[PDB]
């Protein structure tokens, strides 16, 4: 079911020769289809095999890794691309695993705020410590969770953006969702932020619960 | 100027039954294979059935077989795929799709088939055993002193649509609405944040709408430093 795609969140900018790969499901040289997802739209077809042949998008099969190099990028393009395969077997149709291209820019760092749970909550029955890494680029962002210095696994959620349209980066939504018992048991509460763009692991925090 | 329009999807508990419908347009359906296509919330895509709706042919992916039947109507033009005894994993959002042809094709050359040439634009089928909840709003109130940043959190609805704007509509640079994640609970939870200048806390007020159709609820907190 999974074909591996060998490229998977890679970036670039326009004007730029990318190439994206994709492993094979049987032996046999069989078709190939590539689409084009934009958020949130219907995917759309590109290329097929055999005879593959605007100018930019091109198809290529090298032995059991086809390949899908696009040589004249332009910003209409910039999104998710699926391989897909029609196997000869189970009359069964199986996909890539999906590559996303988004826009290359320069290192931005993100801004870190730290928010406690508003009482207006706890009184409810429970704490939800939030965390945000605000507008960066690289996309690739560690945030571990310390409760009393001890960093807890297992109950952080995370939610990212897509791209926004005048920066094109990102924002993170670290969400501890803590019982109200289990928060008022500990005092100092951090966030710490590891990323790409600053050169030490930057940490938000404060001090309440007991 | 052909187009294919899916039908079918929404709301239903795990265990129920929910069948989809796709009717086609401008071409000739019967000399064109018809497959449902599915993807999970920012998940990939993954096939589900395909049929050949001249000779009757069905063909199933082996993570729904048992489940799911997909069937067509040659007189109506329209496609089903009846989904029963439906799993809590099979949320997606379901697409309808065409290839080319050829009964030679279908038995001896099916690899060297086709792409997918139209696509329609899609039905959302979600599963859960959760009544539909209006979302309780939290502030987020920043404490600190340049330019700060504040927000509202959004948790324990279901079903998915809500929107949130803030001072109805006013404020839109800087408005950083996260995408919704479904807790443990079942039920969805989302928080919105917004920059600001540090002179704006005493001076401006803050307030963010949160709407949420499903439960004809509209919910208003002020966010405030504390």
């Known amino acids: 079911i999974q074909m591996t795609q060998s490229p998977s969140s890679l970036s670039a900018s326009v004007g730029d020769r990318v190439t994206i790969t994709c492993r094979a499901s049987?032996?046999?040289?069989?078709?190939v289809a590539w689409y084009q997802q934009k958020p949130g739209k219907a995917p759309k077809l590109l290329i097929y095999?055999?005879?593959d042949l605007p100018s930019r998008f091109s198809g290529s099969r090298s032995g059991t890794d086809f390949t899908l190099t696009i040589s004249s990028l332009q910003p209409e393009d910039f999104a998710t691309y699926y391989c897909?395969?029609?196997?000869?077997?189970?009359?069964?149709?199986?996909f890539g695993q999906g590559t996303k291209v988004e826009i290359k820019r320069t290192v931005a760092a993100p801004s870190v705020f730290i928010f406690p749970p508003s009482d207006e909550q706890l009184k409810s029955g429970t704490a939800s410590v939030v965390c945000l890494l605000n507008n960066f680029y690289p996309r690739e962002a560690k945030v571990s969770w310390y409760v009393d210095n001890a960093l807890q696994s297992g109950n952080s959620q995370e939610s990212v953006t897509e791209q926004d349209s005048k920066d094109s980066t990102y924002s993170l939504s670290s969400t501890l969702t803590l019982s109200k018992a289990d928060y008022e048991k500990h005092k100092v509460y951090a966030c710490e932020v590891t990323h790409a763009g600053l050169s030490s692991p930057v940490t938000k925090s404060f001090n309440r619960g007991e | 100027e052909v187009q294919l329009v899916e039908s079918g999807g929404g709301l239903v508990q795990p265990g129920g039954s929910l069948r989809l419908s796709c009717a086609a347009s401008?071409?000739?359906?019967?000399?064109?294979?018809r497959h449902w296509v599915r993807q999970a919330p920012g998940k990939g895509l993954e096939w589900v059935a395909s049929?050949?709706?001249?000779?009757?042919?069905?063909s199933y992916a082996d993570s729904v077989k048992g489940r799911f039947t997909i069937s067509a109507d040659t007189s109506k033009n329209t496609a089903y795929l009846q989904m029963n005894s439906l799993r809590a994993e099979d949320t997606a959002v379901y697409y309808c799709?065409?290839?080319?042809?050829?009964?030679?094709?279908?038995?001896?050359?099916?690899?060297?088939?086709?792409?997918?040439?139209?696509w329609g634009q899609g039905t959302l089928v979600t599963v859960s055993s959760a009544s539909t909840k209006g979302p309780s709003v939290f502030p987020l109130a920043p404490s600190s002193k340049g330019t700060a940043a504040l927000g509202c959190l959004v948790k324990d609805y279901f079903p998915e649509p809500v929107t949130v704007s803030w001072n109805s509509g006013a404020l839109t640079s800087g408005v950083h609405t996260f995408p919704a994640v479904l807790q443990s609970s079942g039920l969805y939870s989302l928080s919105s944040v917004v920059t600001v200048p540090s002179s704006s806390l005493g001076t401006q007020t803050y307030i963010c709408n949160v709407n949420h159709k499903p439960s004809n609820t509209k919910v208003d907190k002020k966010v405030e430093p504390k």
């Open positions: 799709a065409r290839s080319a042809a050829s009964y030679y094709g279908y038995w001896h050359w099916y690899h060297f088939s086709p792409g997918m040439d139209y």
């Open positions: 401008g071409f000739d359906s019967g000399a064109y294979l």
């Open positions: 049929i050949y709706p001249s000779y009757g042919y069905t």
């Open positions: 049987q032996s046999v040289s069989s078709a």
């Open positions: 095999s055999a005879s």
């Open positions: 897909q395969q029609y196997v000869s077997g189970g009359w069964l149709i199986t």
